Amino acid sequence: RTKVYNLLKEMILNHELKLGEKLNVRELSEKLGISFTPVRDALLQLATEGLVKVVPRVGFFVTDVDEKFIRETIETRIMMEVFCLENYFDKIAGSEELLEIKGEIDDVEKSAKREIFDDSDERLHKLFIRASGNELIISLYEKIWDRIDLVRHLNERYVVSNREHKELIERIISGDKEGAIEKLKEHLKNVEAETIKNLYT
Amino acid sequence: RTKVYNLLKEMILNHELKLGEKLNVRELSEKLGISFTPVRDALLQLATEGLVKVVPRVGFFVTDVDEKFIRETIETRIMMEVFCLENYFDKIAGSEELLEIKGEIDDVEKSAKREIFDDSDERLHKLFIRASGNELIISLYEKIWDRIDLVRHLNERYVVSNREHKELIERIISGDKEGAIEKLKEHLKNVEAETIKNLYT
């Protein structure tokens, strides 16, 4: 149930199962060599998360992504990341993980290696959330991050995002709370706009 | 389906199925008069929501409630409700729904009827979230409200909460965003403390 959930989610997030694609439990079970029941269980789990849609009298489909999808994700990120950066600022600023990430970011500034960036991006934003120690918020944000991953194909600006991340960390390290928050908001709004523009290719 | 899920969730939230109680799929199916499949489907969804726990080779149980559960809910409420009240203030202030809630509050103060209070409490806090128009945040908050309903038995201070709601709404109508946010945070912290204190009675 979990192995298969994780496998099917990976296939949706990396678009092996395409946005909007019709999903058939039996096809998947045969494709994956896994019985029917845990495939169905996993699809239902994915439906409650919004990555799968269940259309009465028809069946399961991979979610479509439209402007609303992107916008709702970004507003949710603003709400959660800002709350956590504001209220757990000193914990974040003093963390060993912030310094590791800072190094990754410097590496990207030189290499423009997208893979390192992707790592650093997930790590930085999840750090802000993890610092709360609130398992409920952490678990909710894991699913919000899935929505971000789903639209990664539209998020081309990584070189400029990396500069934004570099500056954000500098503000955090210096103690500039309000400046850090403003930079985080600017970054998220810039991502929103770029992501949406690329939706319309 | 969702109907079965709603019935079972309702039985948890009203403590027909007690906190920590072992849930038997066979027994539940027979009680509700339905096939096993949708009962199992519903329990698995409730498990992903945190209202049910799955214990390996043992089975399903209603969640227990402890201090962490309460605290994590309350922090998440502060996060979401403050963000929506801050960013959608004028929309909330001008809504007809705020005026109806205002009237229910006066009913409660005169009458101290709990049932009217519980309606007003859900309506006021959900109004703040609904004003965002963000369906993702609205859908997440629906499940956070389930966690609030689960601990209603610990939340005795409704007469004083109602007076806090009265002041909060007066601050919204007066146009004092900052004062309204302060009062909302105070109210939520006061609910937290007393719900926790009543946990250990």
Side-chain angles (χ1 to χ4, degrees), chain B residues 13 15 42 62 70 80 108 124 129 138 141 146 174 182 199:
Chain B
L13 295 186
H15 309 297
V62 181
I70 291 160
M80 303 177 70
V108 171
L124 182 55
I129 300 299
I138 293 164
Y141 193 82
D146 294 330
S174 78
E182 277 206 347
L199 187 67

Side-chain angles (χ1 to χ4, degrees), chain A residues 65-67 69-75 77-78 81 114 117-118 121-122 124-125 141 144-145 147-165 168 182-200:
Chain A
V65 166
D66 56 12
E67 180 169 348
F69 186 103
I70 293 160
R71 291 199 194 277
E72 286 190 353
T73 307
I74 289 284
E75 180 170 39
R77 289 182 76 177
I78 293 171
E81 299 187 28
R114 173 99 202 203
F117 170 79
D118 288 336
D121 183 24
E122 181 180 5
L124 186 54
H125 299 276
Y141 192 78
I144 297 307
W145 199 269
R147 296 170 65 101
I148 293 160
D149 279 341
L150 190 67
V151 300
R152 195 195 278 186
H153 57 116
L154 297 175
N155 184 6
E156 293 172 356
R157 69 187 297 272
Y158 78 98
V159 168
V160 175
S161 288
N162 194 69
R163 298 173 189 151
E164 291 166 347
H165 286 158
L168 173 55
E182 293 177 350
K183 197 63 140 165
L184 174 57
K185 287 170 174 177
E186 284 173 16
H187 166 72
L188 292 170
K189 290 174 167 145
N190 289 344
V191 167
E192 187 183 22
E194 155 91 3
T195 306
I196 290 173
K197 178 173 219 174
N198 287 336
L199 182 69
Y200 302 112

Side-chain angles (χ1 to χ4, degrees), chain B residues 69-82:
Chain B
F69 186 99
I70 291 160
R71 174 178 71 246
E72 293 190 348
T73 304
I74 291 278
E75 184 170 38
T76 304
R77 290 180 75 179
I78 292 168
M79 176 180 69
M80 303 177 70
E81 296 182 33
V82 170

Side-chain angles (χ1 to χ4, degrees), chain A residues 16-17 31 51 83 98 101-102 119 138 141 160 187:
Chain A
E16 173 167 358
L17 297 169
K31 171 193 216 186
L51 294 178
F83 178 83
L98 192 68
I101 294 167
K102 170 180 164 354
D119 187 58
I138 293 166
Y141 192 78
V160 175
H187 166 72

Side-chain angles (χ1 to χ4, degrees), chain B residues 19-163:
Chain B
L19 291 180
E21 180 176 344
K22 179 88 191 311
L23 302 170
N24 187 311
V25 169
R26 181 246 200 147
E27 282 169 18
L28 293 166
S29 299
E30 313 213 306
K31 183 190 183 69
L32 299 178
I34 49 158
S35 68
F36 309 135
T37 296
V39 174
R40 175 177 178 272
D41 293 341
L43 297 176
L44 286 172
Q45 178 175 345
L46 286 162
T48 204
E49 297 179 359
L51 297 179
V52 164
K53 302 297 173 53
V54 178
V55 180
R57 306 181 309 275
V58 184
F60 300 100
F61 291 79
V62 181
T63 188
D64 274 311
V65 168
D66 59 8
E67 178 162 353
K68 184 170 149 54
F69 186 99
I70 291 160
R71 174 178 71 246
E72 293 190 348
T73 304
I74 291 278
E75 184 170 38
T76 304
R77 290 180 75 179
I78 292 168
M79 176 180 69
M80 303 177 70
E81 296 182 33
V82 170
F83 179 86
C84 292
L85 179 62
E86 177 147 35
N87 288 292
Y88 297 95
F89 188 80
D90 291 337
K91 182 170 174 183
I92 293 162
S95 72
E96 188 224 290
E97 173 72 340
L98 193 73
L99 298 184
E100 295 188 13
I101 294 165
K102 174 189 106 218
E104 285 192 301
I105 293 171
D106 291 330
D107 282 354
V108 171
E109 177 57 52
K110 169 180 190 299
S111 70
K113 197 161 214 155
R114 176 73 186 235
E115 295 85 357
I116 298 176
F117 172 83
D118 288 337
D119 188 55
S120 72
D121 185 21
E122 187 177 358
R123 286 170 71 178
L124 182 55
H125 298 278
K126 281 190 171 170
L127 169 63
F128 296 158
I129 300 299
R130 187 187 314 118
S132 66
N134 181 317
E135 294 301 327
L136 175 61
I137 294 180
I138 293 164
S139 72
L140 294 179
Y141 193 82
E142 292 287 295
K143 300 180 204 151
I144 297 295
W145 193 267
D146 294 330
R147 296 172 63 102
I148 295 159
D149 277 343
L150 190 69
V151 299
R152 197 192 280 185
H153 62 116
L154 299 172
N155 184 13
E156 291 168 355
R157 73 189 295 273
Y158 77 97
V159 170
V160 173
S161 289
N162 189 69
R163 290 161 186 173

